[PDB]
Amino acid sequence: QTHNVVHEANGVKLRETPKEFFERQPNKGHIHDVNQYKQMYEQSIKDPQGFFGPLAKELLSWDHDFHTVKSGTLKNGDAAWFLGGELNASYNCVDRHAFANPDKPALICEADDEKDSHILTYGDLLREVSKVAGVLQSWGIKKGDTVAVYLPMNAQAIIAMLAIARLGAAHSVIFAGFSAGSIKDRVNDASCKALITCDEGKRGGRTTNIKKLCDEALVDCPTVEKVLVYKRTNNPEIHLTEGRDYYWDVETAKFPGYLPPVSVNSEDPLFLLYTSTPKGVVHSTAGYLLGAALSTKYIFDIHPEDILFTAGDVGWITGHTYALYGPLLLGVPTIIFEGTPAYPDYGRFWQIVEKHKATHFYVAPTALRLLRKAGEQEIAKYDLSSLRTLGSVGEPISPDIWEWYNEFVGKNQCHISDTYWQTESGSHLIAPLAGVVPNKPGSASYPFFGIDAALIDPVTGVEIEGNDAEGVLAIKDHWPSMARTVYKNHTKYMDTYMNPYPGYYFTGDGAARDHDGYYWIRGRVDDVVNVSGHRLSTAEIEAALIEDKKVSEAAVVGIHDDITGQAVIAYVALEGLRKELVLQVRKTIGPFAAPKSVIIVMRRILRKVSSNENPQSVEGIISAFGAQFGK
Amino acid sequence: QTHNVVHEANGVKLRETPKEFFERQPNKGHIHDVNQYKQMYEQSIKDPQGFFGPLAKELLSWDHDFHTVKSGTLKNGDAAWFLGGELNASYNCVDRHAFANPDKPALICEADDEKDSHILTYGDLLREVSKVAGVLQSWGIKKGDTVAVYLPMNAQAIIAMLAIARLGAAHSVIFAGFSAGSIKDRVNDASCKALITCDEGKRGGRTTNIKKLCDEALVDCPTVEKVLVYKRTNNPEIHLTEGRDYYWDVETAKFPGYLPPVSVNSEDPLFLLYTSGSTGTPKGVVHSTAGYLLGAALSTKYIFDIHPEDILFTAGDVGWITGHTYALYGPLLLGVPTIIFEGTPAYPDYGRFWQIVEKHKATHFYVAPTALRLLRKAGEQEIAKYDLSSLRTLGSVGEPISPDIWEWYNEFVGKNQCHISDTYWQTESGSHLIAPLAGVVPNKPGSASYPFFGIDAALIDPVTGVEIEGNDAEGVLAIKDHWPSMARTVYKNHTKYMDTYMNPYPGYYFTGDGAARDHDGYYWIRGRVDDVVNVSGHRLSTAEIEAALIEDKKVSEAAVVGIHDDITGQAVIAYVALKEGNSDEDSEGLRKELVLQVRKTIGPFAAPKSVIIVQDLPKTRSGKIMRRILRKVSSNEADQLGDISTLSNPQSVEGIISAFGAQFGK
Amino acid sequence: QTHNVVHEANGVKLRETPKEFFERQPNKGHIHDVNQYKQMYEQSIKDPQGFFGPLAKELLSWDHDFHTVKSGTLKNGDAAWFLGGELNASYNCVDRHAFANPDKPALICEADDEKDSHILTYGDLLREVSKVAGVLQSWGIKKGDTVAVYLPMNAQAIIAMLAIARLGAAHSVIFAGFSAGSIKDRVNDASCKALITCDEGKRGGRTTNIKKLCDEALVDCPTVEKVLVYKRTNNPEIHLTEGRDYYWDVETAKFPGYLPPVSVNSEDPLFLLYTTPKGVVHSTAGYLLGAALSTKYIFDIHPEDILFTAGDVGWITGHTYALYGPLLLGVPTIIFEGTPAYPDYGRFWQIVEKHKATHFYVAPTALRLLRKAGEQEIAKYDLSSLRTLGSVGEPISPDIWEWYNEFVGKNQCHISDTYWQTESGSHLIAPLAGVVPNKPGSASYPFFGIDAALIDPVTGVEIEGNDAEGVLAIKDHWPSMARTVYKNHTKYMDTYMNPYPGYYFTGDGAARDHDGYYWIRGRV
Ligand SMILES: CC(C)OP(=O)(O)OC[C@H]1O[C@@H](n2cnc3c(N)ncnc32)[C@H](O)[C@@H]1O
Ligand SMILES: CC(C)OP(=O)(O)OC[C@H]1O[C@@H](n2cnc3c(N)ncnc32)[C@H](O)[C@@H]1O
Ligand SMILES: CC(C)OP(=O)(O)OC[C@H]1O[C@@H](n2cnc3c(N)ncnc32)[C@H](O)[C@@H]1O
Ligand SMILES: [Cl-]
Ligand SMILES: [Cl-]
Ligand SMILES: [Cl-]
Ligand SMILES: [Cl-]
Ligand SMILES: [Cl-]
Ligand code: NA
Ligand code: NA
């Protein structure tokens, strides 16, 4: 009952699902109780083929059957699922539902200003997706290409993503808050052939310069051949470059409301999602989609009658998986909110839920803290009795915020799903299944299907057996929606996720496991570099070098090494002193913590320099490293 | 029994199919009787999924099965059939028959001069199609590209079409009678990367300049990268442009007689066919693959009653939809021989059609009333020279067939022993819409009879826009749901498609025709409502002719209307006002100078019957031309013009009447 | 009993398979005796549909079923097999075995110097093929393209061929001994978009100029957009051209250990192989089936066996029987980079003993070199693992046949004299291991689907009866028959199909004795 390590768990009563949850539930739940959940989970770990095989044929529609459910290992970074299978993301998110019930709502779009809100049915969505795909197809976009999206969180963003996927190309969504420089970096790394954007945006009543920032970036993006521009404000002063920029409404009017979707392999890339050097996290098609549908269905308890409001942005993985793919795969309506939680006032989130009788709400604690600070009294003004599942994503939720969320939004009648996951996981890793798992406020509870979670000692990399334990959070095998690579940089992928703790997937997070098996996310770890099995701290070495009174500044970075895995390179600003500094680190940290080399002369720049790859300071590091690295 | 609206039907005895039809029929008919037809038709309307699903799985060979028979609505212009399916048109027209019986005749080609006639088996056709496709593939032609064809009605035209379709590309066939300008317009709108043509043609013994017209147009077609030229005359004086033009025989010799066909989706475009309407710019009608092919096979089989033992002679040209569907795709899908006639009905004499039928013992003949009117006028005495006892189905396409011509067709060609199929349809419908099924539906001469499978026809009141319930009715002819072979768009101009076919009568397809429905449910086509002119089976745009006349800088205004013609069905009458003209002695010469303009701009077949020189055209208060007055005068109905005090220039009406009365004859 | 024409057949004793062959055989033979072979052979001629249909389904893995087994005729040069079906050469050679037994050896690579030797399992091979395929895919290589290979006989050559076929493109292997001009003529004729080579080579201890020859030829090969250069020696002084030349290790590191294979049609080109030089084209399904069929039955390969084909991927022998044949059957294949003389003349035998190779395939030219200067080295090594010895490329004199059988085979192995050409794809006439008794100097009976005949050159009429001589020809096409000469089908017709219309012209003269055994006389 008592915990000596997981202090968070001491004195925490399980919180059973409120009875009103099941009264509002449209059908019998997908899982009866925790005993059934454990039986299914154990199979998903010991017999992935027998577990995910049938589910993949149930939840997804295939153009070609797969012959192997699961292939590859973490250690080799060659994970693959449903090999030989072929499918299309937009067919599974649009076509199949439009044929069944074309009038069912698909995108409930709430604009920055409600006067501009509107609803697209699945039939409406198929026509818009088909028309945009037709425009891109006539522009030469085909399987294997990348297309950039720089759009606000509205229908056009969702249509653009699904149209790109309809042709077998990968979309790369760029958050509409990014600067021109951030657009340039991501477009060039992906070598996008086309870009979809709009003239201007609306956020909190203000006008944002969307197209203007694209033009600024495009002067340095030679791969972009054509741009489709939607008239979001229809400002006549917004310039379009002849021969490159074309209007969404003008071009889409030329094409018919049906276009055949293009089959892609299960392991063909569905999208690139750049992370904040930006890395293009790449996701497969079949595996990702299954994870999105599976987690949306079982963790949120989503039925055909339900309505999902994910207060996220397609610019981030949350919007990808739980505003778009998850809900549309299951054929339910999804609420796409373009504005802010405060405009026109601080009751907007709740006005939207009441308007559309949303049954599921998914938001980040950052937004809950704001509404608690400035708009708490607005919540009671709205009927929120349609809700039964309240989700939280992206960051620790304190027990105090959990209770506030539970009381003021849920009226102590909803289930709360504190979902732990990350961009590279594609979908939920640890979360309480709605109506199944009892909650402990601040704990994500059990690992999800196909997620064999473990705790690793950060020094030895060895799994920690038993409960009341703490350590590095790691997964012991790959899972269907796991990211497959970093675009054209698979070595950075291996060095980040598979090599730090060989045989495991490295989440970068620390966590604790209590006597009931519940996981408590404890936050980021301290970025250790693995040199021949000894894990080193770049920050700890910098501190040891600085202790030398002749040293004024010190910067230590890590790079890939073909022999020792990683190598540590230390840069110092003030031959015999170089050896004295290495001896200093040995006697301070340890004999095996000595840098591979000490160079007397933004660590992002130092890493690339060390691997042969105040702006005026950059010159000194390049020439200094190239002259004294030698031995 | 009595009709108050449909006067055509009053006193019209049903004409049962002659007994000799069933003695000549090689097998049990495809449909038992008219009652079975009604039952099947109702299912094609109420349960399209259960009806067309099985038929598509019987008649077409699939590389991938379809998961949904039917999608979309007219109102949204998103029709689709057999979604998820994959197939190839050339596989279903050639490969599968060549494997079954490679020696069976496929293309029975009758050249302009019979000494050049020849027969291609299905095996022969597979090898040539593979070779031409091999050339196009090495030129970079791939799925999604368009390829132009400018060929006479011969074996090379069919081979070109099937080779383009073998690669997954869409062909755009350009009628060999078109001028250079008309070739330019069609090639540029489709952005064709390649063109297939020949050096010269043969028609009626005369030599036609095919390649010469391409060179002229290609100076303004920057997208065309390479041209394949067949040696039809092998005239060494025909220039080939280095680096662009290549010889069919030289290039095809580099590639093998088999090329794997390329799978395409049911809804990938099979071809573009540019059509004239009421706009003045030709619009490229687009057809899907699966739906179009099924319609072609289904109508060829059930309306004409085509069996494997049969032989079909469609007296048409692939430059028009009739040759597409019923000289090529229809018959080849069903695996029967089809007769490809390069010549005219008059050369070497007016018995050619019947010499061909007798030579090859054709069982089915498909022709335009324009030819029947000509053969009745000039060649009736030729029929008795030929044995036509192999025929049992006589078809009529493209224009109204008067009861007199119907009787003439029935007696002098069919010997009152064949079934007649007056087929109503149009380019955008892909295949037959209303037609009497051979051996099943009794005929009323001049009536297309019942709508075909999947065609829910209706009549719409022109005043109220509401559908007319009940029979003995007349109105705008409209279709209430889309059908497999319905055109899917206008190339890169889907808005023009919607505004033309789907938006005029929301929820319906607008055929452009008016029609009447009698007490028996038989439909009587009454002609276009949208002032489209059909001259000798050729669908023309009055606006496109006006534009050609205006290009002549000696012309200031031009207005073109249509009238009835005892020979061509309809005739085009052009009214022209000259800037600073006069010269009554130069009038005869200037009228011919304008006719030559239309020939060199559009083509010889678009030339007006008559050009009328007037001082100015009757216009409205806003200055726009009142073509109604030109129509009424041109049809001798000048006493029906009515109140003209709403024109800005009512005094011009007197001049129009006298000008037409003075220059129409001479 | 006596031969008036086939003087080679007079007084030649049949040589039954030694009993030790069957003691070393891991499983029951695939054919019991000659009488069971003749039943199968007659069906493969009278009924190609019912014979090769089921065999194609047993031996190859299909992504799409085929609808017609056989189409076309020789006279029309439109031969085709398994029409409508789709597959992938690299899936059948790598993927499907890696999923079953990822740790089974695939490429037993013996380098010029043994210190550099290594072994790739099927699991290893799948990851290397995928990374190299992923490189080519990013460079724009797609189905329909050709990619040239200028590599020695080592892992990288087999990985390049399989990685090119993985995308649906056609590899055009160029023997690493060719001059810059010979490289140029082939690259331009095929219009390759990319090339895969190495910096330098090691043969017999000598360093060979590989990249330097490519660069000399590339100055006249505009179609080549990018070159992948492996570091076989890692010599710093080897110039890579900025913007065109990239390093194998550097690019492959950017891509994952799995890439989905691309489906191709049965009759899509698997490769071009040049013999001015003419690009012989082989289909995918036909060629692969013939390769697996001949390897399974003429050599009597079983899953437990280990094939050592001392050939070179620059020629057809390395295509069909160093790579596609053994990999399709999921057995390990031995890839030897160096010469039989370095470090000494016991190199072949030290290799056979090292990896317990069960099959050995070599040309008589190497046998004449070893009989001349390496006969003493054979006794030092243990060759008791062998049971099938192969001869290819040249006529084998009864002298060489008797020396090959005793010194190498210890008079305990079966010798298969395989006669075939680059245009045949696989064996045309050969003695099946453990089935067909031997006559030294003879190739014995035609193989499945090979209807062999003799034609009188003067009269051009097929010669009925036995004890005959004349030009050798086949009466119908077979699955692995070359389908054309790249972009020049007329040269193909004039060479093979038009000399004797209705027949395939081998260009060789042969004799058939009263037992039906064929004797290859040579070129006409
Ligand atoms: C979800 C998506 C937006 O995340 P990313 O942007 O990829 O960042 C992922 C990182 O976020 C943090 N995290 C996500 N979920 C939770 C949670 N439930 N409790 C506590 N920390 C959480 C972790 O540090 C994770 O590695
Ligand atoms: C068939 C193909 C060549 O037609 P298009 O050239 O596309 O022109 C179509 C138009 O032709 C006319 N029409 C066709 N068939 C008949 C018929 N049986 N009776 C009376 N009018 C007919 C109609 O006005 C139709 O809209
Ligand atoms: C195998 C491959 C490398 O051959 P190619 O390089 O295409 O040359 C083929 C020519 O080689 C000769 N030949 C091959 N095998 C034998 C043999 N067993 N007995 C006698 N002559 C043989 C023949 O003249 C053949 O036409
Ligand atoms: Cl594996
Ligand atoms: Cl040291
Ligand atoms: Cl719909
Ligand atoms: Cl054939
Ligand atoms: Cl050479
Ligand atoms: Na396919
Ligand atoms: Na398939």
The DSSP code sequence of C72-123 is --TTTT--EEEET-EE-HHIIIIIHHHHH-TTSEEEEEE-SSGGG-EEEEHH
The CA-atom distances, in angstroms, between B143 and each of A137, A141, B136, C61 are 12, 13, 11, 27
Closest to A408 measured CA to CA, from A443, A429, A434, A382: A382
> Up-side HSE of residue C211: CA atoms within 13 Å toward CB?
22
How far does CA A67 lie from the centroid of its chain?
29
Closest to C88 measured CA to CA, from C335, C259, C275, C305: C259
| Dihedral pair phi/psi, residue B665, rounded to 5° | -60, -80
| Dihedral pair phi/psi, residue A42, rounded to 5° | -60, -40
Residues of A within 8 A of B79 (CB-CB) are 258
Measure the CA–CA gap between A22 and A178, rounded to whole angstroms.
Answer: 42
The CA-atom distances, in angstroms, between A150 and each of A138, B366, B664 are 21, 58, 65
Q: Are A537 and A526 in contact (CB under 8 A)?
A: yes
Measure the CA–CA gap between C129 and C142, rounded to whole angstroms.
Answer: 15
Contact yes or no for A76 and C127 at CB 8 A? yes
The DSSP code sequence of A192-241 is -SEEEEES-EEETTEEE-HHHHHHHHHTT-TT--EEEEE-SS--TT----
| Chain A touched by B280 (CB under 8 Å) | no
Closest to A215 measured CA to CA, from A180, A179, A177: A180
Task: Tell how strand B509-517 and strand B473-479 pair up.
Answer: antiparallel
Residues of C within 8 A of B126 (CB-CB) are 78
Task: Tell how strand B271-275 and strand A360-363 pair up.
Answer: unpaired
Q: What is the 3-state secondary structure (H, E, C) of A330-385?
A: CCCCEEEECCCCCCCCCCHHHHHHHHHCCCEEEECHHHHHHHHHHCHHHHCCCCCC
How far does CA B588 lie from the centroid of its chain?
34
- Bond into C395 cis (ω within 30): no
| Chain A touched by C156 (CB under 8 Å) | no
Residues of C within 8 A of A81 (CB-CB) are none
Closest to B338 measured CA to CA, from B320, B370, B363, B321: B363
| Dihedral pair phi/psi, residue A521, rounded to 5° | -70, 130
Closest to A592 measured CA to CA, from A570, A563, A568: A568
Q: Are B428 and B275 in contact (CB under 8 A)?
A: yes
Q: Which residues pair with C149 in a beta bridge?
A: C173, C196
Q: Is B542 exposed, middle or buried (0-12, 13-18, 19+ CB in 10 A)?
A: buried
**Looking at chain C, which subunits does it touch, using at least 3 CB pairs closer than 8 Å as the criterion?**
A, B
| Chain C touched by B404 (CB under 8 Å) | no
Give the type of residue at C303. Answer: P
Closest to B372 measured CA to CA, from B403, B348, B396, B352: B396
Q: Are C358 and C349 in contact (CB under 8 A)?
A: no
Q: What is the DSSP letter of B244?
A: T
Q: Give the CA dihedral B123, B127, B129, B130, nearest 10 degrees.
A: 130
Resolution (A): 2.7
Measure the CA–CA gap between C27 and B416, rounded to whole angstroms.
Answer: 78
Measure the CA–CA gap between B63 and B437, rounded to whole angstroms.
Answer: 31
Measure the CA–CA gap between A311 and A336, rounded to whole angstroms.
Answer: 8
Q: Are B292 and B429 in contact (CB under 8 A)?
A: no
Q: What is the 3-state secondary structure (H, E, C) of B481-511?
A: CCCCCCCCEECCCHHHHHHHHHCCCCCCEEE
The structure's method of determination equals: X-ray
Indicate which ligand has the atom closest to the C-alpha of C70. Answer: 7
Is residue C178 helix, strand or coil?
A: coil
Q: Which of residues 446-485 of A touch C (CB under 8 A)?
A: 484-485
| Dihedral pair phi/psi, residue B123, rounded to 5° | -60, -45
Q: What is the DSSP letter of C379?
A: G
How far does CA B499 lie from the centroid of its chain?
22
Residues of C within 8 A of B65 (CB-CB) are none
Tokens linked to C246: 């990239």
- Helix runs in A47-179, H state only: 48-59, 89-90, 96-100, 122-138, 155-166
Measure the CA–CA gap between C335 and C337, rounded to whole angstroms.
Answer: 7
| Dihedral pair phi/psi, residue B540, rounded to 5° | -120, 155
Helix (H) or strand (E) holding A44, with range, is: helix A34-46
Measure the CA–CA gap between C151 and C109, rounded to whole angstroms.
Answer: 14
Residue C479 sits at the vertex; the CA angle it makes with C473 and C482, to the nearest 5 degrees, is 65
Q: Are B93 and B338 in contact (CB under 8 A)?
A: no
Indicate which ligand has the atom closest to the C-alpha of B102. Answer: 7
Is residue B89 helix, strand or coil?
A: helix
Sign of CA dihedral B421, B426, B427, B430: negative
Helix crossing, B211-218 with B180-190: angle to 10°? 60
How far, in Å, is the centroid of ligand 6 from the Cα of B462?
29
| Dihedral pair phi/psi, residue B146, rounded to 5° | -115, 145
Q: What is the DSSP letter of B328?
A: I
Breaks (C-N over 2.5 A) in chain A follow: 276, 574, 601, 613
Q: Does the CB atom of residue C317 touch ligand 3 within 6 A?
A: yes
Which domains are assigned to chain B? 7-512 (3.40.50.12780)
Q: Which residues pair with C518 in a beta bridge?
A: C444, C512
Long-range Cβ pairs for the range B96-104 (8 Å, 24+):
B96/B61, B96/B335, B97/B122, B97/B332, B97/B335, B98/B122, B98/B123, B98/B125, B98/B126, B99/C68, B99/C71, B99/C83, B100/B335, B102/B126, B104/B335, B104/B337
Measure the CA–CA gap between A530 and B307, rounded to whole angstroms.
Answer: 78
Indicate which ligand has the atom closest to the C-alpha of C66. Answer: 10
Tokens linked to A243: 């021969």
Residue B230 C-alpha, separation from nearest chain C C-alpha, in angstroms: 18
Q: Which residues of B554-575 are buried (b: 16+ CB within 10 A; e: fewer)?
A: ebebbbbbbbebeebbbbbbbb
The DSSP code sequence of B440-481 is TSPB-TT--BSBPTT--EEEE-TTT-PBPPSSSEEEEEEESS
Helix (H) or strand (E) holding B284, with range, is: strand B283-287
Length of chain B counted residue by residue: 666
* Best probe residue, ligand 3, of C282, C400, C439, C520 (max atoms within 8 Å of C-beta): C520
The CA-atom distances, in angstroms, between A365 and each of A314, A442, A542 are 18, 12, 34
User: Between B77, B83, B492, which is nearest A257 by CB?
Assistant: B77
Measure the CA–CA gap between B439 and A602, rounded to whole angstroms.
Answer: 87
Give the number of the atom of ligand 3 that is nearest the alpha carbon of residue C523.
24
Tokens linked to C481: 């028959």
> Up-side HSE of residue C471: CA atoms within 13 Å toward CB?
20
The CA-atom distances, in angstroms, between C410 and each of B116, C21, C229, C380 are 72, 11, 44, 13
How far, in Å, is the centroid of ligand 1 from the Cα of A391?
13
Measure the CA–CA gap between A477 and A72, rounded to whole angstroms.
Answer: 10
Q: Which residues pair with C257 in a beta bridge?
A: none
The DSSP code sequence of A378-414 is HHTTS--TT--EEEEESS---HHHHHHIIIIITTT-S
How far does CA C188 lie from the centroid of its chain?
24
Residues 6 or more apart whose CB falls under 8 angstroms from that of A243 comprise none
How far does CA C212 lie from the centroid of its chain?
28
Give the number of the atom of ligand 1 that is nearest the alpha carbon of residue A419.
18
Closest to A178 measured CA to CA, from A323, A280, A275, A282: A275
Q: Are B299 and B452 in contact (CB under 8 A)?
A: yes
Residues 6 or more apart whose CB falls under 8 angstroms from that of C257 comprise A72, A76, A77, A78, C126, C127, C130, C131
Give the number of the atom of ligand 1 that is nearest the alpha carbon of residue A521.
20
Tokens linked to C460: 């051009």
* Residues making up the binding site of B for ATP: 398-400, 422-427, 513, 528, 539
* Residues making up the binding site of C for CoA: 203-206, 317
The CA-atom distances, in angstroms, between A524 and each of A510, A528, A533 are 6, 11, 21
Measure the CA–CA gap between A45 and A454, rounded to whole angstroms.
Answer: 13
Residue C208 sits at the vertex; the CA angle it makes with C203 and C212, to the nearest 5 degrees, is 155
Tokens linked to B141: 């032609």
Closest to C385 measured CA to CA, from C20, C17, C4: C20
Residues 6 or more apart whose CB falls under 8 angstroms from that of A615 comprise none
Residue B405 C-alpha, separation from nearest chain C C-alpha, in angstroms: 49
Tokens linked to B66: 């379809």
Q: Are B595 and B555 in contact (CB under 8 A)?
A: no
Residues of C within 8 A of A76 (CB-CB) are 127, 257
Breaks (C-N over 2.5 A) in chain B follow: none
User: Between A77, A268, A493, which is nearest C260 by CB?
Assistant: A268
Q: Are B113 and B205 in contact (CB under 8 A)?
A: yes
Residues 6 or more apart whose CB falls under 8 angstroms from that of A348 comprise A339, A340, A341, A342
Residue in A closest to C64 by C-alpha = A64
Measure the CA–CA gap between B438 and A376, rounded to whole angstroms.
Answer: 79
Length of chain C counted residue by residue: 524
| Number of Cβ atoms within 10 Å of the Cβ of A243 | 8
Q: Are A173 and A273 in contact (CB under 8 A)?
A: yes
| Dihedral pair phi/psi, residue A21, rounded to 5° | -55, -45
The CA-atom distances, in angstroms, between A608 and each of A535, A613, A619, A623, B288 are 21, 5, 13, 13, 53
Contact yes or no for C256 and A64 at CB 8 A? no
Q: What is the DSSP letter of A16?
A: P
The DSSP code sequence of C117-176 is -EEEEHHHHHHHHHHHHHHHHHHT--TT-EEEEE--SSHHHHHHHHHHHHTT-EEEE--T
Q: Are C485 and C281 in contact (CB under 8 A)?
A: yes
Measure the CA–CA gap between C511 and C7, rounded to whole angstroms.
Answer: 9
Give the type of residue at C384. Answer: S
| Chain C touched by B260 (CB under 8 Å) | yes
Helix (H) or strand (E) holding B366, with range, is: strand B364-367
Indicate which ligand has the atom closest to the C-alpha of A101. Answer: 6
Is residue B26 helix, strand or coil?
A: coil
Contact yes or no for C78 and B254 at CB 8 A? no
Measure the CA–CA gap between B307 and B27, rounded to whole angstroms.
Answer: 8
Measure the CA–CA gap between A183 and A180, rounded to whole angstroms.
Answer: 5
Measure the CA–CA gap between B611 and B576, rounded to whole angstroms.
Answer: 7
* Residues making up the binding site of B: 203-206, 322, 398-400, 422-427, 513, 528, 536, 539, 599
Q: Which residues pair with B540 in a beta bridge?
A: B533
3-state helix, strand, coil in chain C (%, to 5): 35, 20, 45
End-to-end CA distance of chain B: 48
